[PDB]
Amino acid sequence: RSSVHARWIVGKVIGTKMQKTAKVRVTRLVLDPYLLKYFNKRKTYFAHDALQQCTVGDIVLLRALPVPRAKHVKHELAEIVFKVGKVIDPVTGKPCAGTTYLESPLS
Amino acid sequence: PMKGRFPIRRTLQYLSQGNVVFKDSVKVMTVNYNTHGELGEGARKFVFFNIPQIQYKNPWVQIMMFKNMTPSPFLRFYLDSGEQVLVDVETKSNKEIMEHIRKILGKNEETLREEEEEKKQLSHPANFGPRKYCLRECICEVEGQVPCPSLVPLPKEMRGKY
Amino acid sequence: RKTRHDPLAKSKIERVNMPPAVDPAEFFVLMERYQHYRQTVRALRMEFVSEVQRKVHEARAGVLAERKALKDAAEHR
Amino acid sequence: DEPWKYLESEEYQERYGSRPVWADYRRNHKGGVPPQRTRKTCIRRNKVVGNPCPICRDHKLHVDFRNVKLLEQFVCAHTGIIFYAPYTGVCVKQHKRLTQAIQKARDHGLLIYHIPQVEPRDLDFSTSHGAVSATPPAPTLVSGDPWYPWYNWKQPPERELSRLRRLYQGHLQEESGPPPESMP
Amino acid sequence: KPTFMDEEVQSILTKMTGLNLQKTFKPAIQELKPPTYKLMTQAQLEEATRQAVEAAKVRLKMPPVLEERVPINDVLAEDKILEGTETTKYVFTDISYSIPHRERFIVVREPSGTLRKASWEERDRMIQVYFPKEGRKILTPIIFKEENLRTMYSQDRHVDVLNLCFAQFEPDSTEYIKVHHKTYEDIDKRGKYDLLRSTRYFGGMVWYFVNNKKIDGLLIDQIQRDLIDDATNLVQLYHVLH
Amino acid sequence: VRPRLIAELARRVRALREQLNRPRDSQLYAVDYETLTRPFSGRRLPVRAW
Amino acid sequence: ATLNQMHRLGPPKRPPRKLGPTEGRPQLKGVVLCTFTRKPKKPNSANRKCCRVRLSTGREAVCFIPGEGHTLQEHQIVLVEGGRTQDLPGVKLTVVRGKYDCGHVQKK
Amino acid sequence: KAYRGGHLTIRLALGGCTNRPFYRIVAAHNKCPRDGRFVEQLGSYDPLPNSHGEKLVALNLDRIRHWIGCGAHLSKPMEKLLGLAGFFPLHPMMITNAERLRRKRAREVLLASQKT
Amino acid sequence: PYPPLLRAMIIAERQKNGDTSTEEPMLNVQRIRMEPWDYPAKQEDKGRA
Amino acid sequence: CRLIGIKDMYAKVSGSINMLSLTQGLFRGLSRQETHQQLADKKGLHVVEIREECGPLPIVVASPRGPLRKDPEPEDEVPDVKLDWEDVKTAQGMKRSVWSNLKRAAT
RNA sequence: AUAGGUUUGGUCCUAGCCUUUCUAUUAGCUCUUAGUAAGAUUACACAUGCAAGCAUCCCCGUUCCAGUGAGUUCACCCUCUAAAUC
Ligand SMILES: [Mg+2]
Ligand SMILES: [Mg+2]
Ligand SMILES: [Zn+2]
């Protein structure tokens, strides 16, 4: 099927400071073999988009490509999960701040 | 002693006590949980204890945690086909959601029991492995055969002084 | 062993390599054994590569593979 | 001269009594941790050197397989495992005599030991299979014919024999015909 | 109609096999791990006793009495071509996992050019030179001989012999049968019968006897202690079998 | 990673001193007919061909 | 160190220190240059016959001569061994007796 | 490793001491050595008689149906054992070596009857 | 006929299916050709030195 | 322990090894022991065994002198206990010294 | 680590060093006979002799074995797929 490895990834955009691509910082959880606690080891993946939809700070999904389309461009931003600020609260789908409902339900 | 608060979480027997192992088609589980909600304490004690147990058993799924991005706790999964499961967790305990994923996206025990014989057949008993992959490097190391001429002096039917 | 070059010294520049002798009462059945052995083995090869091929067919699009493959996409939904 | 008349008699209860044999011997070594390979030879062939082993200071304690209670002294009571040599401190040549003669007497059944109750080899006890039931034999082999009639010497016509004489004229060999079949 | 594995004739000989749980689960002499501590109330004691009787029943279900042998030696291939040309006896073994044990093809070749079919003594040994398990030295050990056995019945060791055959000889063989009946003969001469009461007592003692009409040595036991219906629910079993 | 320029080049002139001047059918297949030796090969012939 | 601290450091991490005889080799040969005597440290008083040797390497290291007498002078090949001599304050090598130009001791 | 001329071949391997040979059937590539690695481990071959007349041998057969089913050659001493197993036809080269002592016995009974 | 073991094996398995079917186990021969050892090659398979 | 009457014991003293603080700390711990009869009396509840030589039988050790409390115990698993590192890394068993699994005399 | 010795006039604590155990090579002194394992230290220089041939010639094969540890993150998993055997 595809050639690049990590098929399906959610991440966070750092910098959109090029054209039609975004820099996405993703975190796995890896185990210390000795200390035996999980720690966020990051890695930086690029993400190609079309509409320049993302701005610096959002949480983005990104889907892997069947072929890398540059030397470092690897995935396309298949959906943008959490917008900066304008987070649609995914169950009860309505705009909200941190922990407080801007558009309250019982609408 | 050990340096944590609940320090049983770092013992390698605990991380195996989790049982929620994901199917091949789940590729990201993303959790989002409130930090001071009186009503969401299950999704706080979920990520406190349980998701280290999940990561030891499906160790390639990306797990990611967010803190105050939403008023209600939820889980959201990212299947390989492309749909997004939306598990909710609010006003549950940390126990029910260790039961609410193993009945949805946890593997069936029939599909893990049939996954346990095939891990055995490649470690097949009658191979002659170098005491690390299998037993009996010689047929001298089973009884009845003529035993490995370091162990015995062998009869005069050998060459060299025949 | 030899490495393209080293001078192929005096022992084997000429050693006239005459062969062993031929057994025509048995060689004209020994030639008739091998065509009766190479052809029978070549029948067992196509017994088994076709056997291995069905063992690939029964797990790719197989009759109990298709029934598994529709089962899970029901128990998923 | 053939023991097991020693371990109950009067020199035993006036020496050891209720304690095991090794209850006065404990060895001489360097500091701290004692060496794992115990001295192999208690006695070498004509005389004993230094301190002797627990089964080497007495000349009237000789081990065999029928010395039932002496061999019970070197196996732990609720843990069936033979002691390693530096627990007892015996010579390891005498401990090769004690690691056989336990099992030599374990294998005669005169010492009680554990065997776990096991699970069977197979869950099916059915015995109707073509290797273990009966096999319908060969329509060649019932008739006195082997397999595959090309084994026996189908001697060729002479035209194929003389084919090599004008192929291999300077080198041939001389023969007899089809084989004589069986042996003395 | 004789049919030992019928559903009701077990439930009586499973019942006249005693429960007597402290004799069953004695502490085995092994290399102990230090004991673990649970603390369970009278409500949760009774679910742990009943678990220890739910787990006690499943140790009381094997074996059956299993159809004394027929020696299978048929020859498939006997070529008149080899016949004393090259010697020493090759034995051929099919090996996999996903074939069961009595479904297995083990074949010997002979110096005379036959293909013999590995008589029953060899085949289970050829499993154990290859598929090893618990205990089980593959040759006859020097315990099972008549003299080396006669030391053993002196020492109240009959379960210890009945648990030795269950490894060494499969209960369809004859060398399981010829030394089990060598034991239950000598259990009756000087009847010491309260020793076999909760390990393989459903058929090893009585289903030998009810075939062999020596059940008078087993009903004195059912009047020495009390064992009242235990007596009468097997004296009925004489008539409904024979 | 090391780019291997002289290894690539000396391949492509090894084929060039093979392709351009491949030795033709004659000067390897001439036989000195008395000792059964050939030029350019050194190897005499098997026993069924004398 | 808290838990995030010890993950940043990792395991313990050590080198060895190869001793007097160069880069931790058992024996070493050399040639003698001078056999002089050195005076020991403060609790002890003697004078101990210790030589100076250029090794296999070409390093001059001062070395000790055990036993009653020494016979070595200025060209002889000796085989040195690395045991520190405890009342000398920096003599680290010793000669093994019965080797390569130096023999054993004169037993009475 | 990428070799030249590679094919899988079912061969024997020496796992013994001096004066105690032991042979071990494996599936191995053409060019990797005898005491080198392999791709799959098969039955065993005991080449020495033990107690009561036995030169043992194994054949992990349902995977040699697979490994010859993917098209792997064999070695000339290996086909001596499958052919004499009755899994495969008896080797005609073994049949020659079966027969060239009968020819020796066709001059052994002569030299004992021309004598006596 | 099959060699003595696969001839012995396959008839046993049909006996485990449930149809007896006591026909002899014959493998085809005509579907495999009979070119003897002096059938020529094709030249671009080989390559000149 | 030979003087007390104890026949089998594992004990390791870490920290300082001083011959008097060891024994006055030996008699301190060994005096403050929970007997199984007194294990019941504080909690009212019934005390059993699960051994490796017997089966899963709940063989009884001690019962109170009188009444028994009815409610099942609050079994909050994987408890907040400060478990020691030198024993759980032992139970994983990677790290090995040449000074542990030794063959010494008969004490 | 079941641990022990050593700071001081002495005690206690922190502490390093060393001892006790096991393995591997060299060195001393010393050594009866069999069996199996194992056996340049040096990517330093090499006298010599042997180590690739087979075969109705063509081809194929000497690109494998065997060796050494100079160098060094080209060894494992996935995708795509080329030579090779069926
Ligand atoms: Mg050189
Ligand atoms: Mg290097
Ligand atoms: Zn060996």
Swiss-Prot record, chain C:
Q: Any idea which GO molecular function terms this record carries?
A: RNA binding
Membrane-spanning intervals of the chain: none
One GO biological process term: mitochondrial translation
Q: Which GO terms describe its cellular component?
A: mitochondrial inner membrane; mitochondrial small ribosomal subunit; mitochondrion; nucleoplasm
Where is the protein found, in the record's own terms? Mitochondrion
Please give the chief subcellular localization of this protein. Answer: mitochondrion
The entry's keywords: Mitochondrion, Ribonucleoprotein, Ribosomal protein, Transit peptide
**Family designation:** Belongs to the mitochondrion-specific ribosomal protein mS26 family.
| Name of the protein in its database record | Small ribosomal subunit protein mS26
Q: What organism is listed for this UniProt entry?
A: Homo sapiens (Human)
Q: Which gene encodes it?
A: MRPS26
Curated annotation (Swiss-Prot), chain D:
Miscellaneous information on this protein: There are 3 mitochondrial isoforms of bS18 in mammalia, localizing to 3 distinct sites in the mitoribosome. bS18m (bs18c) binds to the same site as bacterial bS18, mS40 (bS18b, this protein) binds to a novel location of the 28S small subunit, and mL66 (bS18a) binds to the 39S large subunit.
* Gene name per UniProt: MRPS18B
Subunit structure, interactors included: Component of the mitochondrial small ribosomal subunit (mt-SSU). Mature mammalian 55S mitochondrial ribosomes consist of a small (28S) and a large (39S) subunit. The 28S small subunit contains a 12S ribosomal RNA (12S mt-rRNA) and 30 different proteins. The 39S large subunit contains a 16S rRNA (16S mt-rRNA), a copy of mitochondrial valine transfer RNA (mt-tRNA(Val)), which plays an integral structural role, and 52 different proteins. mS40 has a zinc binding site.
The UniProt entry's sequence similarity note says:
Belongs to the bacterial ribosomal protein bS18 family. Mitochondrion-specific ribosomal protein mS40 subfamily.
- Organism of origin is Homo sapiens (Human)
MF GO annotations: structural constituent of ribosome
GO terms for CC?
A: cell junction; mitochondrial inner membrane; mitochondrial small ribosomal subunit; mitochondrion; nucleoplasm
Superkingdom of the organism of origin = Eukaryota
Q: Does the keyword Ribonucleoprotein apply?
A: yes
Major localization class: mitochondrion
Q: Where in the cell is it found?
A: Mitochondrion
Q: Which UniProt keywords apply?
A: Mitochondrion, Phosphoprotein, Ribonucleoprotein, Ribosomal protein, Transit peptide
* Protein name in the entry: Small ribosomal subunit protein mS40
One GO BP annotation is: mitochondrial translation
UniProtKB/Swiss-Prot annotation, chain E:
Compartments in which it is found: Mitochondrion
UniProt-listed GO biological process terms: mitochondrial translation
Keyword tags: Acetylation, Disease variant, Mitochondrion, Phosphoprotein, Primary mitochondrial disease, Ribonucleoprotein, Ribosomal protein
Question: What is a single molecular function from GO for this protein?
Answer: structural constituent of ribosome
Regions crossing the membrane: none
Effect recorded for residue 136 to H: In ODG7; uncertain significance
| Residues with the N6-acetyllysine modification | 145
The Gene Ontology CC terms held by the record are:
mitochondrial inner membrane; mitochondrial ribosome; mitochondrial small ribosomal subunit; mitochondrion
Q: How does it assemble?
A: Component of the mitochondrial small ribosomal subunit (mt-SSU). Mature mammalian 55S mitochondrial ribosomes consist of a small (28S) and a large (39S) subunit. The 28S small subunit contains a 12S ribosomal RNA (12S mt-rRNA) and 30 different proteins. The 39S large subunit contains a 16S rRNA (16S mt-rRNA), a copy of mitochondrial valine transfer RNA (mt-tRNA(Val)), which plays an integral structural role, and 52 different proteins.
Q: Which disease is it linked to?
A: Combined oxidative phosphorylation deficiency 5: A mitochondrial disease resulting in severe metabolic acidosis, edema, hypertrophic cardiomyopathy, tubulopathy, and hypotonia.
The similarity annotation says: Belongs to the mitochondrion-specific ribosomal protein mS22 family.
Protein's UniProt name: Small ribosomal subunit protein mS22
The species this protein belongs to is Homo sapiens
Curated annotation (Swiss-Prot), chain F:
Q: Where in the cell is it found?
A: Mitochondrion
Q: Tell me, how does this one assemble?
A: Component of the mitochondrial small ribosomal subunit (mt-SSU). Mature mammalian 55S mitochondrial ribosomes consist of a small (28S) and a large (39S) subunit. The 28S small subunit contains a 12S ribosomal RNA (12S mt-rRNA) and 30 different proteins. The 39S large subunit contains a 16S rRNA (16S mt-rRNA), a copy of mitochondrial valine transfer RNA (mt-tRNA(Val)), which plays an integral structural role, and 52 different proteins.
- Family recorded in the similarity comment: Belongs to the mitochondrion-specific ribosomal protein mS34 family.
- Quote the function comment for this protein: Required for mitochondrial translation, plays a role in maintaining the stability of the small ribosomal subunit and the 12S rRNA that are required for mitoribosome formation.
So which disease is it linked with?
Combined oxidative phosphorylation deficiency 32: An autosomal recessive disorder due to deficiency of mitochondrial respiratory chain complexes, I, III and IV, and characterized by delayed psychomotor development and neurodevelopmental regression. Additional variable symptoms include poor or absent speech, inability to walk, and abnormal movements.
Its recorded name reads: Small ribosomal subunit protein mS34
- Its source organism is Homo sapiens (Human)
- Shown segment, full-protein numbering: 6 to 55 of 218
